[PDB]
């Protein structure tokens, strides 16, 4: 399914591909998942994470 994301918590690079750790709206932090970037439709939240990295 498609769900609303609260925040992008982290990013990792594995096998030449980018994945993000996502906090899902209305779900426990125990339900955070790593998702391939192609799954994401949250550009403003990715922009927030990269700026927090600087």
């Amino acid at each position: 399914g498609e769900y609303v994301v609260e925040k992008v918590l982290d990013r990792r690079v594995v096998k030449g591909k980018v994945e993000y750790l996502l906090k899902w709206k209305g779900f426990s932090d125990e339900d955070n998942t790593w998702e391939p970037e192609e799954n994401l439709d949250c550009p403003d939240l990715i922009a927030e994470f990269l700026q927090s990295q600087k």
């Binding site: 399914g1 769900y3 996502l22």
Partner: peptide, 9 residues
């Protein structure tokens, strides 16, 4: 809205 698809399985 900021959404994403959650990988199933």
């Amino acid at each position: 809205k900021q959404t994403a698809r959650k990988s199933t399985g």
